[PDB]
RNA sequence: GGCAAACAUCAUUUGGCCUUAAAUGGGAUUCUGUGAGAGGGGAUCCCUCCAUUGACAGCUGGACUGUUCUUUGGGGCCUUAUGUGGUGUUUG
RNA sequence: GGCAAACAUCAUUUGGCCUUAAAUGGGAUUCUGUGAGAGGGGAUCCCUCCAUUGACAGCUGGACUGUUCUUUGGGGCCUUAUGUGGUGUUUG
């Protein structure tokens, strides 16, 4: 019942807008206050803005100060995040976050329930889908072994991207390693599942890739030659 | 403002080990202090608040303390799923503050990798690029070396490696190097191989291939 | 939160009807079966009535089948029992409860909360209010002892009559006993309160009558000689 | 069609002890079994169903067990409070049957009630009778004798009393006995008195007023 | 030197309104498995605060105050945040 | 003798629909104090049912089978009530 839903991530040029919203369920938003709280990749967190529904009251950090302006409509029950004259430097997961209120308190609590985050990347590169290949079994061992078969994301931007298999019916021995940036300023990662050697000649095992940033979806099978 | 300074920035133990992160308050911060647990690529959930007190659903093998404007976050038996970062937060006055975080590794037994190559798909060689895959499944320690030979002559620097997460069940890693090159380029040569040595491994070991077939 | 609350009891002829109603809250009623259960003053528990709101159904005892009807309205969250061609021995309190609804079951549990409960008497006699007196001290004890006063309410129908002392700011001490029905058909109670005999000539004690049949209600202020 | 023979009718045990009421069934119930608990003037409240399980928020020292057809609900240690009637009711079939009950008393230590006696108000006879009471105030056992003397001539016949449920706190009971008579009967004679008897009391008490005083 | 104030520091820390004669806080034993914010609730006992009845003291009334005693009582609706104490420094 | 049905008795007991290769049930150790129906949840091992990939077997291919080995998997939407077995009696 209790979760929060971000939206709104997604590619901006520097000097742009963006509205984030975050969408509550199973509690009501005037007994809490709402937190956005982002992680610039590979820093720790920055606590961003604050606002108690119950009041209105808002406060910001001193580093969006007059570019944010945090909101929220009690009728929707979500919170807003709007961001004007964006930086590179405002590249990062931005989290929305929850404080139950407490009518014993005197001041708010600890952040007790976090959503999963959303990602805003401010760049001057535009986005374009990547590319998806096979990775099949090679056919090389015997019965001591068993076979790995993957696919290959190659050539896109911005992150992030999101990879399945069977469209989730495959999950035991599966890895997508994080992309590493190409000499192109490009992204490429990989994505493998380990099966026993036997299964590759019945079983048909299909990989989804999804690059929502530029509406990209691909299915391709994996089998060998 | 109210500064969180958190030690170590990172660890690494045996599973069964007592674990103690520390974070120090610049100034009193008196019991609202609380520490979040990140896996990665997840949002964080809270797991102590008021300094020692367990959030709704957190293993009791977890437990903090106040000392002064010192404070503590202990795992009496350290668990694999528990490998993760770790902040301290002061909620005493505003702006609330963060500690810069306490990544913790797990340290197991060696375990060997296992080693795959893929050559590249005939649709990427249509496509005019080829890339070539070496796979390093499901050992420990993180510490592993990947050399790439074209002919048996030693590749530097047109490779990239990314690494997984400890995998929160096994505490393993996974390794992928992909040597990428421009298409023509790979109709000059016959042998392609990825050498691996590590740990667990007496003799390195190398997977190669002929070119197609 | 879970509550139910029977209104339309009260007094009526023989041959008369009657529609109790049951409003119930902190659960819906298409998620449990009500029931009504009566119980003859002094005698045990008869099962009345039955009814599964999701589905209509209806059962009855056999004792009321075709003069009764048990319903209920879904949008109202209440239920109802129709009472037509009572019967003196059809004079009792009447309880609705509710037995909860569970998915996993193959017949009807228990019945897990049951109303206060309504006091429905069938009768040839009249609603008539009581008379009130005050039972006062003879002045035996001095100060080393306690005293006792009360008062005396005679002569009305039907039950009940409800006492309080000093709007019930004084509790500890007092009783109230049972009703006994009078050789001229009528009802009496005693209620008495216990005092310091020392408070008698400073403290006022007043008692409150309640005959809510005949919308009676006497405050009777109870001193000695 | 199905009966549920509860025994025993009534029982009284001190605070303290273990008590058992048992049920049995006409034929196969099962399980479907539930036990209640009715205090005076309220509603019977669930303690046990499926025979053995205690519904949520019943004090522990009730259970419920099943042996075949005969179920016994047993309150292993008995508090003031649980003075009550208890039923048990099975609900395997229908219709839904109850057995026939068992009155729970509690047994404390003698006490001696304290007696006062009160003359009719003046209110009262300008209507023409007189309602003389004498009050028993908290005593135990429950069985106590009043007897009225009118210039020390005893009555018959124009007396009723009526006793309280025992205290859900001291246990104990409180008793009103009422003498009615005429005005123009009551204005006869001088001294009016009840004389109680009662395990507690090593001679009768008499309390008593004369009547213009 | 007595103060205010701002700042530092450590420590501690729910805060109101209405009605009322008054509208405290803590301890113990025990029941309650979330049955409405379990940071709960119930029962019973002890202390403490407020009010209150007797008694007693203050010449005696009305008050009013007090007490190693005594009686009876302590309601309702709210709260969405940075108060308070110690120390130091600096200013007026 | 056998098979039904009704009744008696004791025992036991959620029942459907859609999609699907298939759409069971239980046990132990341990974490979870209700997070929204705790009559829960997760983890680890186990047993068990259904299906399934390989192995051995039924001459070999369909197929299909197994007290043995093996891979992997076991979804969704409902439910508002009297089912089932043992025994006895009566009737056809």
């Known amino acids: 019942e209790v979760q929060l839903v971000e939206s709104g991530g997604g590619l901006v040029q520097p000097g742009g807008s963006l509205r984030l919203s975050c969408?509550?369920?199973?509690?009501?938003?005037?007994?809490?206050?709402?937190?956005?709280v982002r992680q610039a990749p590979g820093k720790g967190l920055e606590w961003?803005?604050?606002?108690?529904?119950?009041?209105?009251?808002?406060?910001?950090?001193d580093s969006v100060k007059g570019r944010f302006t945090i909101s929220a409509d009690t009728s929707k029950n979500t919170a807003y995040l709007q961001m004007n004259s964006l930086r590179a430097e405002d590249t990062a997961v931005?989290?929305?976050?929850?404080?139950?209120?407490?009518?014993?308190?005197?001041?708010?609590?600890?952040?007790?329930?976090?959503?999963?985050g959303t990602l805003v990347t401010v760049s001057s590169a535009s986005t374009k889908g990547p590319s998806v290949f096979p990775l099949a079994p090679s056919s090389k061992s015997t019965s001591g072994g068993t076979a790995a078969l993957g696919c290959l994301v190659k050539d896109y931007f911005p992150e992030p991207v999101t990879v399945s298999w069977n469209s989730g019916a495959l999950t035991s021995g599966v890895h997508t390693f994080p992309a590493v940036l190409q000499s192109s300023g490009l992204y490429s990662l990989s994505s493998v599942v380990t099966v026993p050697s036997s299964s590759l000649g019945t079983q048909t095992y299909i990989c989804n890739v999804n690059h929502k940033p530029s509406n990209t979806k691909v299915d391709k099978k994996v089998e060998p030659k | 403002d109210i500064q969180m300074t958190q030690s170590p920035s990172s660890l690494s133990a045996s599973v069964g080990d007592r674990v103690t992160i520390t974070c120090?308050?610049?100034?009193?911060?008196?019991?609202?202090?609380?520490?979040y647990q990140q896996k990665p690529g997840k949002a964080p959930k809270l797991?102590?608040?008021?300094?020692?007190?367990?959030?709704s659903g957190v293993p009791s093998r977890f437990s903090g303390s106040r000392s002064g404007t010192d404070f503590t976050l202990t795992i009496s038996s350290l668990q694999p799923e528990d490998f993760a970062t770790?902040?301290?937060?002061?909620?005493?006055?505003?702006?609330?503050?963060?500690?810069?975080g306490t990544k913790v590794e797990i340290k197991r037994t060696v375990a060997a990798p296992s080693v795959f190559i893929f050559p590249p798909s005939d649709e990427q060689l249509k496509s005019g690029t080829a890339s070539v895959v070496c796979l390093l499944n499901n050992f420990y320690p993180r510490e592993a070396k990947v050399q790439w030979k074209v002919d048996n002559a030693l590749q530097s620097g047109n490779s990239q490696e990314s690494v997984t997460e400890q995998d929160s069940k096994d505490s393993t890693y996974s390794l992928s190097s992909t040597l990428t090159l421009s298409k023509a380029d790979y109709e000059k040569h016959k042998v392609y191989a990825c050498e691996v040595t590590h740990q667990g491994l007496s003799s390195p070991v190398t997977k190669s291939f002929n070119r197609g077939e | 939160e879970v509550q139910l609350v029977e209104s339309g009891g009260g007094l009526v002829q023989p041959g008369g009807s009657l529609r109790l109603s049951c409003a119930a809250s902190?659960?819906?009623?298409?998620?449990?079966?009500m029931h009504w259960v009566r119980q003859a003053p002094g005698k045990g528990l008869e099962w009345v009535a039955s009814?599964?709101?999701?589905?209509?159904?209806?059962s009855y005892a056999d004792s009321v089948k075709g003069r009764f009807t048990i319903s209920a309205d879904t949008s109202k969250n209440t239920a109802y029992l129709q009472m037509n061609s009572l019967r003196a021995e059809d004079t009792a309190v009447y309880y609705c409860?509710?037995?909860?609804?569970?998915?996993?079951?193959?017949?009807?549990?228990?019945?897990?909360?049951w109303g206060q409960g309504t006091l429905v008497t069938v009768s040839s006699a009249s609603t008539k209010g009581p008379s009130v007196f005050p039972l006062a001290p003879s002045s035996k004890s001095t100060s080393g002892g306690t005293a006792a006063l009360g008062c005396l309410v005679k002569d009305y129908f039907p039950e009940p009559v409800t006492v309080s002392w000093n709007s019930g700011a004084l509790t500890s001490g007092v009783h109230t006993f049972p009703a006994v029905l009078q050789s001229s058909g009528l009802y009496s109670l005693s209620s008495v309160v216990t005092v310091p005999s020392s408070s008698l000539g400073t403290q006022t004690y007043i008692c409150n009558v309640n005959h809510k049949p005949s919308n009676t209600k006497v405050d009777k202020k109870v001193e000695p000689k | 069609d199905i009966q549920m023979t509860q025994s025993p009718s009534s029982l009284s045990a001190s605070v303290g002890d273990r008590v058992t009421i048992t049920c049995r069934a006409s034929?196969?119930?099962?399980?479907?079994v539930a036990w209640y608990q009715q205090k005076p003037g309220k509603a019977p409240k669930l303690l046990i169903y499926?025979?053995?399980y205690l519904y949520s928020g019943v004090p522990s020292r009730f259970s419920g067990s099943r042996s075949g057809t005969d179920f016994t609900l047993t309150i292993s240690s008995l508090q003031p409070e649980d003075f009550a009637t208890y039923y048990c009711?099975?609900?395997?079939?229908?219709?839904?049957?109850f057995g026939q009950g068992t009155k729970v008393e509690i047994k404390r230590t003698v006490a001696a009630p304290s007696v006062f006696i009160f003359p009719p108000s003046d209110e009262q006879l300008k209507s023409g009778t007189a309602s003389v009471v004498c009050l028993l105030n908290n005593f135990y056992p429950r069985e106590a004798k009043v007897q009225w003397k009118v210039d020390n001539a005893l009555q018959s016949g124009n007396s009723q009393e009526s006793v309280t449920e025992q205290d859900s706190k001291d246990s104990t009971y409180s008793l009103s006995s009422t003498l009615t008579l005429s005005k123009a009967d009551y204005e006869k004679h001088k001294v009016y008195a009840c004389e109680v008897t009662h395990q507690g009391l090593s001679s009768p008490v008499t309390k008593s007023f004369n009547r213009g005083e």
């Open positions: 409860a509710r037995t909860k609804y569970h998915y996993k079951n193959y017949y009807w549990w228990a019945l897990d909360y």
């Open positions: 902190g659960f819906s009623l298409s998620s449990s079966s």
């Open positions: 009814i599964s709101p999701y589905s209509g159904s209806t």
């Open positions: 034929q196969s119930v099962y399980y479907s």
């Open positions: 499926s025979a053995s």
């Open positions: 009711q099975q609900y395997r079939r229908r219709p839904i049957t």
